[PDB]
Design a protein around this ligand. Structure first.
Ligand SMILES: [Zn+2]
Length: 365
C-alpha cells in the first residue's frame, strides 16, 4: 500500500515518455497538477504549462521539471527480425546488456531484451572492453522482418526501460526508473499544491518540459511561451554516497537535503537569486547541500537565456544510478525541495524580484 505521495510518484515514473514521445507522461502530470492551476496549456512541442495566479500583476515564476526520460528508438528491423535502435538521451553502454525494454508500437506494447555477441566468441581483450552500443540489438522473438512488421514494429517507435517501482525496507528510499526527471515534475506539482492554501505575491508556472535529455529543447520553447521573470530548474543530481566515491568526486549525500547548484555546464547560478534561496532555507530550518555539475546541464540552462535573460537557479535531488533502469532517491530530499521552493516563492513579490534582477537602481522602472 502506497500513500498519496508514493502513489503519485509511482504513476509518474510508470509513465512512458522519451524525448519527442512524452504524451503519456504529460497526461499523468496534467491530471495531478490541474487541480492546483487556473490554466493549463502546452507549447507546440508538448511542454506542459500549469499557471497559478497568486497576484494578478505579480512577477512570473517558472518551476521546470522535464517529462522525458532517456530511452531508445527503433531505427531498423533486420532480415532475421532483430531490432536495431538509437539511443535518445545519454546512455552508458555498461548498464544496458541483458536489460528488459518495452517497444511501444501502433499495435501495442512488445517486450524485448537488449543483447550483443556472446562473450566466448569475443577476444579476451574485447571481452574486457565495453561492448559498443552500436553493436547491440533488441530481441523480441521475431524470426523475420516481415513478422516484426506484422506485430507492429516500425522505425521511430519509442523503446523504454521496464522496471517495477520499489520501496526499500527504509521506506524513505525509493527505487524506480526515470527519477530523472519525474521527481522534478512531482516537485512542480506539490509546490503548486502548497500554493493553493497560501498567499504568494506572484504568478507561478509548474512546467513539465519536453526533450530535456536531447538538449534542453522544450525548456527553450516553454520559457519563450511563458516569458518568466524568475526560474527554478528542478531535476536530479548525482549522489556521491555509494562505494568508491570520494567527496572530491561527488560531495552530496542522499537524505541530507536538496542540492543548491552553484554551477553546471549549462548555467552559472544567478547570485542574487541563489543568495535569496539560501537565506530562505536557513531561516526556515530546511536542510540543503551545495554542489556543482561540471559536465552536465539542466533546463535552467535554456530558460535563463530567454529574451532579456532570466535570473535562475537549479535545485536538484541527489540520486543514485541516474540514466539506468533503476535510480534511487530519498523522500526527505524531495519533500524539503518542495518546502524550500514554496517558502522562497512566498517572498518573491515584484519589489524583491526587481532588486534581484536590477542591482544598480531604477529596478522598478
Ligand atoms: Zn534531468
Amino acid at each position: 500500500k502506497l500513500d498519496e505521495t508514493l502513489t503519485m510518484l509511482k504513476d509518474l515514473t510508470d509513465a512512458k515518455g522519451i524525448p519527442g514521445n512524452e504524451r503519456e507522461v504529460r497526461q499523468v502530470m496534467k491530471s495531478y497538477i490541474e487541480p492546483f492551476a487556473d490554466e493549463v496549456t502546452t507549447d507546440r512541442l508538448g511542454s506542459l504549462i500549469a499557471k497559478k495566479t497568486g497576484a494578478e500583476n505579480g512577477p512570473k515564476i517558472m518551476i521546470a521539471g522535464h517529462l522525458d526520460e532517456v530511452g531508445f528508438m527503433v531505427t531498423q528491423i533486420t532480415d532475421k527480425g532483430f531490432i536495431r535502435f538509437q539511443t535518445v538521451g545519454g546512455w552508458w553502454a555498461q548498464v544496458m546488456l541483458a536489460q528488459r525494454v518495452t517497444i511501444v508500437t501502433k499495435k501495442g506494447e512488445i517486450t524485448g531484451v537488449i543483447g550483443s555477441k556472446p562473450p566466448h566468441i569475443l577476444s579476451p581483450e574485447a571481452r574486457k572492453k565495453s561492448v559498443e552500443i552500436k553493436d547491440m540489438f533488441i530481441d523480441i522473438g521475431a524470426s523475420s522482418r516481415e513478422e516484426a512488421l506484422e506485430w507492429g514494429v516500425l522505425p521511430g517507435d519509442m523503446i523504454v526501460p521496464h522496471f517495477e517501482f520499489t520501496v526499500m525496507n527504509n521506506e524513505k528510499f525509493l527505487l524506480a526508473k526515470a527519477w530523472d526527471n519525474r521527481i522534478g515534475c512531482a516537485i512542480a506539482i506539490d509546490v503548486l499544491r502548497n500554493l493553493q492554501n497560501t498567499d504568494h505575491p506572484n504568478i507561478v508556472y509548474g512546467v513539465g518540459t519536453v526533450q530535456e535529455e536531447v538538449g534542453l529543447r522544450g525548456a527553450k520553447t516553454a520559457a519563450h511561451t511563458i516569458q518568466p521573470d524568475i526560474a527554478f530548474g528542478v531535476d536530479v543530481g548525482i549522489a556521491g554516497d555509494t562505494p568508491g566515491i570520494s567527496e572530491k568526486e561527488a560531495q552530496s549525500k542522499m537524505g541530507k537535503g536538496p542540492q543548491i547548484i552553484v554551477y553546471d555546464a549549462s548555467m552559472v547560478s544567478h547570485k542574487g537569486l541563489r543568495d535569496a534561496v539560501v537565506a530562505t532555507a536557513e531561516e526556515a530550518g530546511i536542510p540543503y547541500q551545495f554542489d556543482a555539475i561540471a559536465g552536465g546541464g539542466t533546463d535552467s540552462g535554456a530558460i535563463h537565456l530567454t529574451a532579456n535573460g532570466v535570473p535562475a537557479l537549479s535545485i536538484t535531488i541527489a540520486t543514485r544510478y541516474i540514466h539506468t533502469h533503476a535510480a534511487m532517491l530519498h523522500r526527505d530530499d524531495y519533500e524539503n525541495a518542495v518546502k524550500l521552493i514554496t517558502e522562497v516563492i512566498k517572498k518573491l513579490d515584484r519589489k524583491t524580484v526587481d532588486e534581484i534582477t536590477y542591482q544598480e537602481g531604477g529596478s522598478h522602472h
